[PDB]
């Protein structure tokens, strides 16, 4: 079938913000022909970001988290991605031999919608179209906003990329990084 | 693919304060492992049909909760805010007057959105079963209202979808009429 | 195949805000049965909005953009739409400009979800449900917000319409109108 590429709904820790498996990234990608429908949430279970305190840790580095998914020409997740390979595969509809996927180019962000940028800016080429910008809410609390920026194909060192950038502006005291669910879509490569 | 909905223009089908005082337009479409949803709420009778927070300034006068409660078969339970008058599958090639096993495919996943026990465990998310954003009353940018959609957090039901609307501004003669809000969630199967 | 109607993912200039072909609208509409899944972004490549300066150009008309898509009873784009029809077509295995489509009623916003309003507004009839109201971010920068209002079927002289209204409040100084990607959905006519 191959219409869902995901972490499953409840992965074990599968993401390295600071240390291996310090966080759980839940990511579902569903193919609806020419668009991928996504939903992402991030829970930090260990380390400074599992109990944010920006009085104790007041630097810019203490107020953001970047999760990078890097893919090769076959749409396979590359080593060096923030998310590890423990939970990343097609949803199975039958229980016959389980193998890592070899091809998911149909799940990749379009290279023509979201080309790689060169650093001489030109007014003819968008700098925004490959970004989705909004807020998520830590603990699902309205008074704990966190900006999310999802960027497509902006990593120079991979064929495709999906990057989730989380940055908060408020000084949080003893707040676990735990983002409310964020729904999004993008144009598929094929 | 398959759609469970109120239709696009239900008659009043919701009880905020009194029977059929409001119209909830709710469309759920199954797309693989996800449900794609859109919701809007119009209050046609009662205090919330003409919000006036000078006359009604209490906290209870500045929020609306719409609860959809479902049983183990994905059937809408009577105590839901929305009544069963407009809640059925979109007419296909074939017709059918009841939902049951097919309804569980529209329910929010219990694995994605598990119930929480006593004092919460820091290894289990509190946030992932919530979508938090803004809608705009009358579709007017200067009339924001927070929306929080919560999945499966109602203790006495197998599944739930709850739409919480809460505003901070003091609205004067503003009908509760929310701009359309799009969302998605992980399906039970 | 007839599940995606789009601008192509990388359109040449296709929009007249002020002058012919001053802007590139990227718009993808994908049919998922009863709902259309959309994503929109707008880059202005010529004219004042290609380098917004609201100190130089301080008036209300200098702080908003309207893109109108007007459709006939067949779902075909009408003359007087902001966008050109040449590259507005179904996605197929043919990636080149081709014969215009004849019918796309299945992509049109529902007349029952989004009826035209009669002059006496009525508390029984929603004024909001045919609108999606949010923010997009110029250049993908959280400090450059822009309101977006998408309105369905509100243009009096057309069978269907999708209108994208962009309006900003900040005094931008030398900021290209370049909107971050905005994801939305609406109820299909059939």
Total beta strand runs of chain A: 11
Secondary-structure element order of chain A, N to C: EEEEEEEEEEE
Helix content of chain A: under 10%
Based on Cα principal axes, name the global outline of chain A: globular
Helix/strand/pairing category of chain A: mainly beta
Main interface: chain pair and counts: B-C, 36 and 29 residues
Main β sheet profile of chain A: 5 strands, antiparallel
Number of distinct helices of chain A: 0
Oligomer: homotrimer
Work out the strand percent of chain A.
Answer: 35-45%
Roughly how many Å is the radius of gyration of chain A? Answer: 17 Å
The structural domain count of chain A equals: 1
Order of strands in the sheet with most strands of chain A: 6-1-2-3-11
Distance between the termini of chain A: 16 Å
Describe the structure.
With about 190 residues, chain A is mainly β. Chain A has one domain (about 1-190). Chain A contains no helices and eleven strands. Chain A has strands at about 5, 25-30, 35-45, 50-55, 65-70, 90, 130-135, 145-150, 160-165, 175, 180-185. In chain A, the strands form three sheets. Chain A has a five-stranded antiparallel beta sheet, with no helix packed on it. A four-stranded antiparallel beta sheet of chain A has the order 5-9-8-7, with no helix packed on it. In chain A, strand 7 (about 130-135) and strand 8 form a beta hairpin. The first copy, chain A, is globular and about 45 Å long. The interface of A and B includes residues 1 and 91 of A. The PDB classes it as viral protein. Keywords: Adenovirus, Type 15, 3D Structure, Fiber Knob, viral protein. It forms a trimeric assembly. The entry is titled "Adenovirus 15 Fiber Knob protein". Chains A, B, C are Fiber protein.
